[PDB]
Design a protein around this ligand. Structure first.
Ligand SMILES: Nc1nc2c(ncn2[C@@H]2O[C@H](COP(=O)(O)OP(=O)(O)OP(=O)(O)O)[C@@H](O)[C@H]2O)c(=O)[nH]1
Ligand SMILES: Nc1nc2c(ncn2[C@@H]2O[C@H](COP(=O)(O)OP(=O)(O)OP(=O)(O)O)[C@@H](O)[C@H]2O)c(=O)[nH]1
Ligand SMILES: [Mg+2]
Ligand SMILES: [Mg+2]
Lengths: 49, 166, 47, 159
C-alpha cells in the first residue's frame, strides 16, 4: 500500500546513492593501482641499457 | 537519468575493450592492451523516450582474473558476451559465459551475443549462421560487429538500450 | 513511530549488506591487481 | 564503531594495527596499498572495525569517504620524523572537514623505542594535541608500548 511504497522509495534511494559512492571507489581504486604500478614498471622498462 | 549496468564478457582478445572504445570515442587501436581485472566507464544515451546512463564494466579475458567477474555479472542489468569470428574456441566458450550469466541473474537479465572482427573475412572460422543458431538456442540477442571498421557497433548498443526495462 | 522504526530497520540492513558486498569487491580487486603487478615488477627485477 | 588510521608513509599505522590484532611485528616495510579492512573484539562487547589507509600519495583520494563513516580517527606520526608530525595538522583538519566536532580523534606519536632518532619531543606532541583539541598518546608498535592503551582509550570515548 502506501507504507510499502514509501519504504520502497527510501530503499531505492539508499541503494542508488551507495551504488554511486562505491562504484566511484572501485573506479578510483582501479586508476590509482594502475597509475601506481605502471610507473614502477616504466622505470624498470627504461633500463634496457 | 536512470542508471543501467552493462558487463562485457568473453575470452581474451576477442575485442570487448575495442567495442566499448569504438562506441564511446569512435576510434580504434590495433595495438593490444590487455584489460587488467576490470575497467569502469560511463556513457549517457539520449533515447527518444528518456535518457539513460550506461555504466560499462569491461572485464578481462585473462584466466587469472576470472574470480573477479561473478559479482559484476550479479550486479549487472545487461551482459554483452563477445567472441571472435576468427577463433572457434572463443565462440565455443560463449555457452559457458551465458551459462554463468543465467546462473547469477536467471531470466532477469538482457544478454547480447556478439561475433566480433567481421573485417577479418578470410580468417573467419565461425559462420554467421552458427552464431545466430547459438543465440537462438540460448534465447539471447545476436549481432556481428567490427570494432575496427566501425560496423554494427552503434547498432549493438541501440539494440541493448531499446531492451532496457522501463 | 511504528512506520519509521520498520523502515529504519530495513534501511540499516540494506546498508550493512551493500557495505559487505562492495568492500569484498574492493578487497578482491586490489588483491588481484597487486598479485599481477608484483609478478610483473619481479620479472623486470629478475632481469 | 569504525576506526580509520591516517598518517604519512611509514609512520607505523599498519604495525600498530597488527600489534593490536595479532600481537606480531615485522621489521620489513610493506607499504599499504589502497585501504585495508579489519575487525576485532576486546568490560563490554567491543565491535571494532578498522580501516588501514595508505600513506602513499597515489591513494590519498580514496581516503575521504572512509573518514566520513569513521566515528574515530587515529592520526599517526613518527617521532623520528618531524615532517610526519607537521603533516598531522593537515590530517586532523581533513577529519574535521568530514566529521566536524562529532568525531573522536587520537594523535599518535609512534616509534618511542627509537630514542636515539627522536626528532619530536613528547612536549611538542602534547602541545599540538591541546592546540587542535584531540587526544594524545606515544607508542611503540615494535615493543607493544601503549598499543593496548591506544585502543582502550579510544574505545572509552565512543558514544
Ligand atoms: N581486425 C580486427 N581487430 C580487432 C577488432 N576488435 C579488436 N581487435 C584487435 O584485437 C585485439 C584485442 O582487442 P581488445 O579490445 O583489447 O580485446 P579484449 O577482449 O578487450 O581483450 P582482453 O581485455 O585482454 O580480454 C587488439 O589488438 C585489437 O586491436 C576488430 O573488430 N577487427
Ligand atoms: N623501531 C620501530 N619501527 C617501527 C615501529 N612501527 C613501525 N615500524 C617500522 O616502520 C616501517 C613502517 O611501518 P608501517 O606499519 O608499514 O608504516 P605505515 O604507516 O603503515 O606505512 P604506509 O602504509 O606506507 O603508510 C616498517 O619497517 C616497520 O617495521 C616502531 O614502533 N618502532
Ligand atoms: Mg579488454
Ligand atoms: Mg600501512
Amino acid at each position: 500500500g502506501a507504507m510499502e511504497q514509501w519504504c520502497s522509495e527510501r530503499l531505492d534511494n539508499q541503494k542508488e546513492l551507495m551504488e554511486e559512492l562505491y562504484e566511484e571507489k572501485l573506479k578510483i581504486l582501479k586508476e590509482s593501482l594502475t597509475t601506481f604500478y605502471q610507473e614502477q614498471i616504466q622505470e624498470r622498462d627504461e633500463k634496457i641499457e | 537519468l536512470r542508471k543501467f549496468k552493462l558487463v562485457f564478457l568473453g575470452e581474451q582478445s576477442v575485442g570487448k575493450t575495442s567495442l566499448i572504445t569504438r562506441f564511446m570515442y569512435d576510434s580504434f587501436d590495433n595495438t593490444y592492451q590487455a584489460t587488467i581485472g576490470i575497467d569502469f566507464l560511463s556513457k549517457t544515451m539520449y533515447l527518444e523516450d528518456r535518457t539513460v546512463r550506461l555504466q560499462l564494466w569491461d572485464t578481462a579475458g585473462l584466466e587469472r582474473f576470472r574470480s573477479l567477474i561473478p559479482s559484476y555479472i550479479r550486479d549487472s542489468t545487461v551482459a554483452v558476451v563477445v567472441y571472435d569470428i576468427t577463433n572457434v574456441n572463443s565462440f565455443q566458450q560463449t555457452t559457458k559465459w551465458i551459462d554463468d550469466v543465467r546462473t547469477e541473474r536467471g531470466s532477469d537479465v538482457i544478454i547480447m551475443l556478439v561475433g566480433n572482427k567481421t573485417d577479418l573475412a578470410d580468417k573467419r572460422q565461425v559462420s554467421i549462421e552458427e552464431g545466430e543458431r547459438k543465440a537462438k538456442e540460448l534465447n539471447v540477442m545476436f549481432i556481428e560487429t567490427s570494432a575496427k571498421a566501425g560496423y554494427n557497433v552503434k547498432q549493438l548498443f541501440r539494440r541493448v538500450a531499446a531492451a532496457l526495462p522501463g
